[PDB]
Design a binder for this molecule. Structure first.
Ligand SMILES: Nc1ncnc2c1ncn2[C@@H]1O[C@H](COP(=O)(O)CP(=O)(O)OP(=O)(O)O)[C@@H](O)[C@H]1O
Ligand SMILES: [Zn+2]
Ligand SMILES: [Zn+2]
Ligand SMILES: [Zn+2]
Lengths: 64, 49, 111, 236, 267, 213, 97, 334
DNA sequence: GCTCTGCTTATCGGTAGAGTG
DNA sequence: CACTCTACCGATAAGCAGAGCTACCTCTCGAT
RNA sequence: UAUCGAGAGGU
């Protein structure tokens, strides 16, 4: 079953903190970051061990 | 008499050690071999005293 | 007994060759596969005896804390050995003794 | 032999507060670098040079809890290390522990180890000395004189291989006779004196050490009791 | 130390052979209790076998999945529990019906062996093996780990009316299952007793709990030869049962009363 | 074989229900009470030997003595359900039967469970009373145990006599839970009192009273 | 006496020694006097008694307090009943007699 | 000191040196007094001999070993602790998903002081616990990290090398069967870099450090802090990796019922802290407090750009009062 | 620093009923 | 009239935190 | 004729 989790991460674009939601679909190995404020979305591959800090880390490197 | 009776009780404990170490000791229901061994040794030594 | 891939060093997992009906040991990080010498894939011992004799070293006769016996060795027929009960630390372990001859270093029993 | 079996408070502190036995000592601490140098000088191989396939029979060597090497002939290594301590080349408070079953050789120069002295018994079957105390009336003579025949006191015995210190860990690997008389078998039936254990489980005993006197297991307070061996233990 | 005192019907209590029959039927035996080792082979031909030991077994027997589950039963434990190879395989069949082909060797064989096949499947056999050892019950009442054969000296009046002793067989258990053991044919269902008065309350009710509570306390006091007058222990067990449920002698029982707050806060 | 223990346990549960009904004050014929296991199998099982629970249901009325003592004792309907799991569908037809024929109390023996949703159809059917029992729990009649003394329900008049003798409020009597095995056996309702005559090692005999929660 | 050293009770015994003397049998009487091994083993059993007395005294002291608080308000009344402070009947007659 | 309720203590002086790097792009200062143990080598009574002992009103039967603090004779009680730098394996209670734990407290050799503590836990109960894997505990990391992952983060990545560090018997199929879940739970981590990053992403620190340094932060938690008694210099992870395998080996020997769990009460696994170690642990704490007071004084006295006279930035009361307080009350700390 | 019980949170079905072909 | 597809209340553990830990008595010592 | 703690003790 999918996991819809709220986090305390800051969006890299709109800078609103505590407004990034992480949807981890392990059945298809696809993780999804969403911003509850400005509405952006970032997708990245996840394994079985990953957690909201794993894809949020991949989002920091995808920008820089 | 006291010293003889204690000496013979020490011998019975030798026999019990022999049986338990040669797999010739009766196991009491609900008890492992080593529990049964310690139980027999204890009864022998308390009866000696 | 499970083996390792000769090109990746990761461990091989058992996988069937469905078409030829034979057991293989295939890797999982690369394409290596090899033929199984042993049909057995898994064993589970409930009543176990592994670790019974355990550390029998060339210097076991130098441990002065071990008791010594007169029992005749089956191999060389020497009258001098050390003994010890099973090194299996289970609660149901037997009390039967293992003897180690100080001459030929054979491990025998009183059976 | 390390803490008193009798002197401990009654009540809430009972068994938690203890008292040093009469012959106890505490390790002050010793540098490990001389120990490393002796181990590499006498055949220890590094861990970067190590493969379990190649070393399937060798002994692992620990110095103050760090795995530092492997040695293929541990029997000679420990005898060498022990003899360096019995002369003074290694500080007498260092612990030298051979675990033969587990193929491990552990050395401790840690501070705070509780140790006690014992008489050394000759254990090498290459001399008539074997099986007997290394200490002789000559040592006792020089002790009473105070000097050697070209100060001679307690530490002179420790650095001449007749007495050494053992801690709780090394005590695990030795065989101790209770009195000098127990070093040799006998021919009694005196109904007044106390019965000595038979010790008939091992055919021949190989004593490595002998107690100096068994009353030294007591501490200061219990040492005041006359005949404590004739009392119910709580009275002591 | 949970324990049941299982009195037996008179005809069984004076015949040691019949009492042993009740004993072996009550004691819980799982499949794990009799299994010495389990194995998983790749034996691709269902009608033959790579196992040289089971060669003559499967060849003659025949006159599904390629993975084989081979489990070996320990002869000593099979003898103690009084179980035959047939009934052990039967119980396996009942839980796996037609999803598993079961093949068992004879009790005369050198090794006691049971072969199993399913009707990617390497892991499905490990899951089945875990489920078998962890859930298959061969006989007995769950929760009754051991059953002991105990002789009772019970005083009963003569035909003359004089009290004389009489030896009778009863059983005692490690573990409890008062409800299920009461139902077992042979057991005197009007006398079965448990040393868990909590269980007595659920099966027999509060007045029986009152008596059982007193019995268990008395046993503690009387053991070191002591004697306390009945009325003191009677008063305590009436307090523990007056509410209709068991009131523990703790704040969780005592302070659940409608007593004043000043009284309750002083505890 | 193993099929015989199913029939036997069901026959024993059946004997207990009749025993329960008799003790509660209803009339059960001395021929149905003493019914052997063989007679039970002949009448209840098929040709294949499997038993038909719907054939075991029966109806009983209070004896004249019980009706004189307890004027709240009506007609009792006992039914064994052939469906192991009793769902909302099964319970509704049972509750309808009870109201339509205006039974005073209905005893519903189930096999494995009663769903909590169907279990709520139980208090929606007053002034008729529905009581449930797991068929297992009745294989042995617990009131036959040495440790369970004879519980006898007090009449409304007898209860009042008790309260005045001790000048008692109801909340000052010892209690018995509604779910107590012996309270369920007697079908005790909140406010009713049992009298319990009991062995005593100091006086020989002692009468204990409990009121039902 | 347990094998608190590796496979032995004291460094004065060989390993795997289950004899009376190895595991705490004190053969001598107090008149004759105990051996050093017996002395220590006797002191082990003796310590356990001092520990028990110091520990279990608070175990039973708390038990008695809870018993007293459970029962403190229970009195025999002039009607013969045994009741608490709520007037609940605990026994209809004290001790049933 | 006894008569007048004084403290018998020695002044301690420390040379201090100032230096001022500047790039456009002192002497015997007194730090406190240490109470002297009577009849020790630093006591004014060690010489004298019975004649002058009597003149100093000292009794020749008094053997010392105690201090005089405000006139009161204080003795230090040896403090019993568990040995450092040794691996002990213990069993865990039934209502826990963990069944066996290996533990080691790491302590340096110089000074001898504690640093950190580390655990390796074997999960999965008896027929309960599903996947029966093994995780480690690292200092300054919030979560348990599977063993295989930390082995790879140290430079040993292929399964076969990791298992060669743990199991020393290719025949031991029981132990190898017990290591199965650890391999599969660390399958997706197939190289050093993604291993080091898997660690760094839980070890507190800041949020948002990119892979380029959150790795370099985990590389620090492995070089130092992790088993620091082994080494703290770089490029010696071969010593630490072999030790980690030893711990796992010891953990499994006990879980396979081939070896008893360690006895926490075995006196050979215990140490007694006497006056030296007890004073050193307290002196370390108090000297750091003095250090922070020196740093805090330079930031006020250097904003004036006036050469500070040093002796005005060392209040010897910090060490003097700290030692006095603990010896006088028995409270061993600040 | 250790045992217990009760109370406050997730998981488990379990039905039990409209939407469905 | 046979299907799912989700809104229910069971019954689970399930994790947790805290509450409690014999009675009375003596004396010295340090900090506020 | 203080308060808060700590430690050592008595039955
Ligand atoms: N720590 C404690 N707590 C409570 N009561 C205690 C106690 N220590 C002692 N007592 C009281 O003092 C009694 C102890 O008496 P002692 O003089 O200590 C032993 P005894 O059993 O009377 O004699 P013995 O010396 O002949 O064995 C206890 O039973 C109790 O009454
Ligand atoms: Zn955003
Ligand atoms: Zn590969
Ligand atoms: Zn030989």
């Amino acid at each position: 079953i999918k996991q819809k989790l709220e986090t305390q991460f800051t969006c890299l674009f709109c800078n609103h903190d505590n407004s990034v939601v992480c949807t981890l679909d392990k059945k298809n190995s696809i993780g999804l970051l969403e911003c509850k404020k400005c509405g952006q979305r970032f997708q990245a591959p996840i394994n079985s061990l990953s957690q909201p800090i794993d894809i949020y880390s991949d989002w920091i490197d995808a920008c820089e | 008499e006291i010293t003889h009776a204690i000496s013979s009780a020490k011998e019975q404990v030798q026999e019990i050690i022999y049986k338990a170490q040669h797999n010739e000791l009766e196991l009491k229901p609900g008890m492992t071999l080593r529990e049964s061994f310690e139980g027999e040794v204890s009864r022998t030594l308390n009866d000696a005293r | 007994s499970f083996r390792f891939c000769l090109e990746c060093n990761n461990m091989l997992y058992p996988k069937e060759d469905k078409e030829n009906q034979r057991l293989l040991y295939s890797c999982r990080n690369c394409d290596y596969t090899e033929l199984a010498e042993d049909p057995k894939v898994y064993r589970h011992e409930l009543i176990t005896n592994i670790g019974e004799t355990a550390g029998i070293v060339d210097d076991i006769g130098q441990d002065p804390t071990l008791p010594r016996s007169d029992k005749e060795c089956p191999e060389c027929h020497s009258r001098d050995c050390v003994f010890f009960q099973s090194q299996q630390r289970r609660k149901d372990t037997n009390m039967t003794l293992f003897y180690v001859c100080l001459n030929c270093k054979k491990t025998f029993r009183d059976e | 032999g390390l803490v008193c079996p009798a002197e401990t408070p009654e009540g809430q502190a009972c068994g938690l507060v203890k008292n040093l036995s009469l012959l106890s000592g505490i390790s002050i601490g010793s540098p490990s670098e001389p120990i490393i140098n002796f181990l590499e000088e006498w055949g220890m191989e590094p861990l970067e040079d190590y493969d379990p396939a190649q070393h399937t029979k060798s002994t692992r060597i620990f110095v103050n809890g760090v795995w530092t090497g492997i040695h293929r002939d541990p029997s000679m290594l420990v005898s060498t290390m022990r003899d360096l301590r019995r002369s003074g080349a290694i500080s007498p408070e260092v612990s030298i522990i051979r675990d033969i079953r587990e193929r491990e050789f552990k050395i401790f120069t840690d501070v705070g180890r509780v140790y006690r002295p014992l008489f050394i018994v000759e254990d090498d079957e290459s001399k008539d000395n074997k099986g007997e105390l290394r200490i002789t009336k000559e040592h006792i003579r020089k002790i009473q004189q105070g000097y050697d025949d070209d100060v001679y006191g307690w530490s002179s015995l420790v650095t001449s291989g007749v007495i050494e210190y053992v801690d709780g860990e090394e005590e695990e690997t030795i065989m101790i006779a209770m009195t000098p008389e127990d070093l040799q078998t006998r021919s009694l039936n005196d109904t007044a004196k106390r019965i000595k254990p038979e010790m008939s489980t091992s055919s021949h005993h190989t004593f490595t050490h002998c107690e100096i006197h068994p009353s030294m297991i007591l501490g200061v307070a219990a040492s005041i009791i006359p005949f404590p061996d004739h009392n119910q233990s709580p009275r002591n | 130390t949970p324990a049941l005192t299982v009195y037996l019907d008179r005809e069984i209590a004076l015949d040691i052979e019949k009492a042993k029959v009740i004993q072996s039927s009550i004691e819980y035996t799982t499949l794990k209790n009799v299994t010495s080792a389990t194995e998983i082979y790749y034996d691709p031909d269902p009608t033959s076998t790579v196992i040289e030991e089971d060669f003559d077994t499967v060849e003659a027997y025949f006159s599904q999945s390629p993975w084989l589950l081979r489990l070996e039963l320990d002869r000593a434990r099979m003898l103690d529990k009084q179980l035959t190879m047939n009934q052990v395989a039967d119980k396996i069949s009942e839980v796996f019906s037609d999803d598993l082909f079961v093949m068992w060797s004879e009790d005369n064989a050198d090794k006691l062996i049971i072969r199993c096949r399913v009707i990617e499947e390497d892991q499905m056999l490990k899951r089945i093996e875990a489920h078998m050892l962890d859930l298959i019950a061969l006989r007995g009442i769950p929760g009754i780990s051991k059953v002991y054969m105990v002789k009772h000296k019970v005083s009963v009046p003569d035909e003359s009316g004089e009290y004389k002793n009489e030896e009778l067989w009863a059983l005692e258990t490690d573990g409890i299952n008062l409800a299920e053991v009461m139902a077992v044919p042979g057991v005197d269902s009007s006398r079965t007793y448990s040393n868990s008065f909590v269980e007595i309350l659920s099966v027999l009710g509060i007045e029986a709990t009152r008596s059982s509570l007193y019995k268990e306390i008395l046993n503690v006091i009387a053991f070191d030869g002591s004697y306390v007058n009945y009325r003191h222990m009677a008063l305590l067990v009436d307090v523990m049962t007056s509410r209709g449920y068991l009131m523990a002698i703790t704040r969780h029982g005592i302070n659940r009363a409608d007593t004043g707050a000043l009284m309750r806060c002083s505890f | 074989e193993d099929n015989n223990r199913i029939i036997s346990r069901l026959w024993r549960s059946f004997r207990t229900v009749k025993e329960m009904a008799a003790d509660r004050g209803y009339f059960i014929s001395q021929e149905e009470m003493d019914q052997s296991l063989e007679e039970f199998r002949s009448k209840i099982c098929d040709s294949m030997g499997n038993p038909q629970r719907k054939l075991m249901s029966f109806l009983a009325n209070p004896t004249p003595e019980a009706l004189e003592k307890y004027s709240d004792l009506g007609t009792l309907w006992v039914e064994f359900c052939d469906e192991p799991s009793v769902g909302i569908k099964t319970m509704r037809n049972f509750c309808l039967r009870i109201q339509e024929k205006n039974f005073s109390t209905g005893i519903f023996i189930y096999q494995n469970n009663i769903t909590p949703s169907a279990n709520k159809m139980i208090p929606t059917v007053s002034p008729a009373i529905i009581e449930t029992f797991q068929e297992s729990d009745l294989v042995v009649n617990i009131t036959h145990h040495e440790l369970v003394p004879k519980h006898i329900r007090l009449s409304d008049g007898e209860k009042s006599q008790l309260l005045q003798r001790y000048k008692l409020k109801e909340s000052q009597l010892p209690r018995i839970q509604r779910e107590d095995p012996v309270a369920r056996y007697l079908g005790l309702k909140r406010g009713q009192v049992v009298k319990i005559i009991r062995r005593s090692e100091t006086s020989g005999r002692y009468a204990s009273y409990r009121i039902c929660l | 006496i347990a094998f608190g050293f590796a496979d032995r009770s004291l460094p004065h015994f060989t390993k795997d020694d289950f004899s009376p003397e190895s595991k705490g049998f004190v053969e001598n009487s107090y008149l004759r006097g105990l051996t050093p091994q017996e002395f220590f083993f006797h002191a082990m059993a003796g310590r356990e008694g001092l520990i028990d007395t110091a520990v279990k005294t608070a175990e039973t002291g708390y038990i008695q307090r809870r018993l007293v608080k459970a029962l403190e308000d229970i009195m025999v009344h002039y009607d013969g009943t045994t009741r608490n402070s709520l007037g609940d009947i605990i026994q209809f007659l004290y001790g049933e007699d | 000191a006894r008569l007048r309720n004084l403290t018998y203590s020695s002044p301690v002086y420390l040379d201090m040196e100032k230096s001022m790097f500047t790039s456009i792009d002192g002497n015997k200062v007194h730090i406190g007094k240490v109470p002297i143990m009577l009849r020790s080598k630093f006591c004014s009574l060690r010489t004298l001999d019975e004649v002058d002992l009597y003149k100093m009103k000292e009794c020749p039967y008094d053997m010392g070993g105690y201090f005089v603090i405000n006139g009161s004779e204080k003795v230090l009680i040896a403090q019993e602790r568990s040995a450092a730098n040794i691996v002990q394996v213990f069993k865990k209670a039934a209502p826990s998903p963990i069944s066996h734990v290996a533990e080691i407290r790491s302590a340096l050799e110089k000074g001898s002081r504690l640093i950190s503590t580390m655990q390796i836990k074997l999960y999965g109960r008896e027929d309960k616990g599903t996947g029966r894997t093994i995780k480690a505990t690292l200092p300054y990391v919030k979560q348990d990290i599977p063993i295989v992952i930390v082995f790879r983060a140290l430079g040993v990545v292929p399964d076969g090398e990791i298992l060669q560090h743990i199991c020393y018997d290719e025949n031991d199929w029981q132990m190898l069967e017990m290591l199965k879940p650890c391999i599969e739970e660390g399958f997706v981590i197939q190289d050093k870099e993604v291993a080091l990053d898997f660690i760094g992403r839980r070890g507190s620190a800041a949020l948002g450090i990119r892979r380029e340094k959150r790795i370099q932060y985990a590389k620090d938690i492995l070089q130092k802090e992790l088993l620091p008694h082994i080494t703290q210099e770089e490029g010696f992870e071969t010593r630490k990796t072999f030790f980690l395998g030893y711990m796992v080996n010891r953990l499994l020997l006990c879980a396979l019922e081939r070896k008893d769990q360690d006895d926490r009460d075995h006196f050979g696994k215990k140490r007694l802290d006497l006056a030296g170690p007890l004073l050193a642990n307290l002196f370390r704490i108090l000297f750091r407090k003095l250090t922070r007071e020196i740093y805090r004084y330079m930031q006020r006295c250097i904003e004036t750009d006036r050469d500070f006279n040093l002796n005005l930035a060392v209040k010897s009361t910090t060490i003097t009062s700290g030692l006095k307080y603990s010896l006088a009350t028995g409270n061993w700390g600040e």
